[PDB]
């Protein structure tokens, strides 16, 4: 598999976190994976020409769509799941929850499950 790490990017500030030495703050495999997941979720699909069709999501395009509330919930689940699952490190993403707090303003939750979260059988002959 041999996945590798990356450098932190504080999305709150929109800038790379750098040590006092001036070098960018290196991060572990899982940290880089989480950063990539957030970036891919924030990246629209088919629109940023630097990427292939695999990368990105289509959540923003869904806002203008005319599908119903539950249809939009299913579309959000499908879009987030498809966007995340391209990464090899991903095992499963699910347990989606939704809360239409105001009349038409939504909050949704999801769980991402890693390949390392798998459970291994213990046996040998």
């Amino acid at each position: 598999l041999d996945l590798k790490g990356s450098f932190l990017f504080d999305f709150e500030k929109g800038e790379f976190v750098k040590n006092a030495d001036g070098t960018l703050k290196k991060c572990d495999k899982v940290q880089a994976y989480k950063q990539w997941c957030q970036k891919a979720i924030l990246t629209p699909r088919y629109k940023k020409a630097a990427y292939t069709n695999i990368y990105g999501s289509e959540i923003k395009d869904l806002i203008a769509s005319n599908l119903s509330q539950s249809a939009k919930e299913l579309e959000i689940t499908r879009l987030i799941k498809e966007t995340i699952l391209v990464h090899p490190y991903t095992k499963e993403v699910g347990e989606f929850s939704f809360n239409w707090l105001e009349n038409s303003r939504l909050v949704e939750y999801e769980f991402d499950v890693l390949t390392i979260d798998d459970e291994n059988i213990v046996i040998d002959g």
Binding site: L3, K4, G5, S6, F7, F9, F16, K29, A32, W36, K39, A40, T43, A49, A50, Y51, T52, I54, Y55, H87
Partner: protein, 94 residues
């Protein structure tokens, strides 16, 4: 018009250029959407676009076998040949 042969370098693939760029990385991840990929991929894409369009156009206009327009006019002027110019329609009106 003769078909223009092109060097292999000028028709290089974008993915090949990006792979050549990313060959030196072995510690940091180079996955699509990663920051290294973000820094490197647009450079490779622009390199491929420029190398395929501009340089091949230069090669095309270089020689008279494939030049056109003002370029072909100048290459005719190299050996003193001018293209026939147009004229205004003339006549009489009652």
């Amino acid at each position: 018009e003769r078909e223009l042969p092109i060097p292999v370098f000028l028709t290089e693939d974008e993915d090949s250029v990006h792979e050549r760029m990313l060959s030196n990385f072995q510690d940091v991840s180079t996955l699509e959407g990663d920051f290294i990929y973000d820094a490197t991929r647009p450079t490779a894409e622009q390199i491929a676009e420029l190398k395929q369009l501009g340089l091949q156009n230069n090669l095309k206009i270089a020689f008279p076998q494939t030049s056109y327009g003002t370029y072909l006019e100048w290459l005719g002027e190299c050996k003193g040949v001018f293209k026939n110019q147009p004229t205004k329609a003339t006549g009489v009106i009652t």
